[PDB]
Amino acid sequence: TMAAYTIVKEEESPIAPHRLFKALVLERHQVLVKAQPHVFKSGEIIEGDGGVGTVTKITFVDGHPLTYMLHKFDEIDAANFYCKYTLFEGDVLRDNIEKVVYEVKLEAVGGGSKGKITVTYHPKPGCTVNEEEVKIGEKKAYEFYKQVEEYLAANPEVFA
Ligand SMILES: [Cl-]
């Protein structure tokens, strides 16, 4: 009940993985305002050079329930379309979550991709991970994912 809580998800995309990996990982801070300008106000690198160790800050628009998030890149293997990164700060963590650790892995399937993401919610000591909260966060994450995919399909030159 006070353990970390992990979900794994796999889905195929018609988008080629080099584009999806830039949009969803490496340059996500530069795409999220373009793909979801009704949710995200800004995305920027606040520390680092783009690679391992980089911290990004994403802020939400006014009127959104959330305010900002900081993520750090832990591991990047761009040739294999793999990244581990950690959401380590922000109001979305509320009081009970220490960090959320993400692993993304894509591979080419014909002209598109197969993607796998693992998400691990780490509660603070003496706290628990609330499943309804995870469900709502994951629904919203899945909306972002699908709207990035719809943006890349509508704008085929981007990251091509
Ligand atoms: Cl600032």
Side-chain angles (χ1 to χ4, degrees):
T1 195
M2 294 187 308
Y5 181 103
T6 295
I7 54 188
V8 173
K9 321 248 206 190
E10 300 188 11
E11 188 173 346
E12 293 189 32
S13 178
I15 304 301
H18 67 287
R19 306 179 62 208
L20 217 36
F21 193 74
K22 288 189 201 136
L24 296 175
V25 174
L26 292 174
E27 302 294 352
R28 176 159 81 167
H29 60 286
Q30 307 198 96
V31 183
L32 38 35
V33 176
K34 295 192 196 297
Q36 293 209 294
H38 63 296
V39 176
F40 295 101
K41 180 166 66 171
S42 62
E44 64 199 281
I45 286 174
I46 60 169
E47 182 157 11
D49 63 359
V52 160
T54 294
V55 173
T56 58
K57 179 170 85 177
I58 286 163
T59 67
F60 289 89
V61 298
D62 298 334
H64 194 285
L66 297 180
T67 297
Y68 78 107
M69 301 175 285
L70 307 186
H71 290 86
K72 179 178 187 164
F73 290 158
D74 305 300
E75 298 176 10
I76 296 163
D77 177 357
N80 281 303
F81 308 118
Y82 172 80
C83 177
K84 179 184 164 279
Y85 63 92
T86 297
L87 168 65
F88 69 88
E89 183 175 314
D91 37 284
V92 72
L93 302 175
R94 310 204 78 169
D95 288 321
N96 58 314
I97 306 294
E98 173 71 27
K99 61 185 183 177
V100 185
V101 172
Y102 294 88
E103 297 181 78
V104 174
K105 176 74 175 65
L106 317 175
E107 60 181 66
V109 179
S113 297
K114 185 222 78 147
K116 176 163 79 181
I117 182 164
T118 304
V119 185
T120 299
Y121 290 78
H122 286 274
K124 295 179 179 173
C127 308
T128 186
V129 177
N130 180 277
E131 289 160 17
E132 297 308 306
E133 282 187 335
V134 165
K135 276 167 190 178
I136 288 160
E138 289 303 313
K139 156 203 153 76
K140 298 311 194 157
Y142 189 61
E143 276 157 15
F144 174 76
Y145 165 76
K146 297 302 280 187
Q147 291 174 39
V148 166
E149 180 181 57
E150 298 179 46
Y151 173 78
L152 294 174
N155 298 273
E157 77 279 5
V158 170
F159 302 140

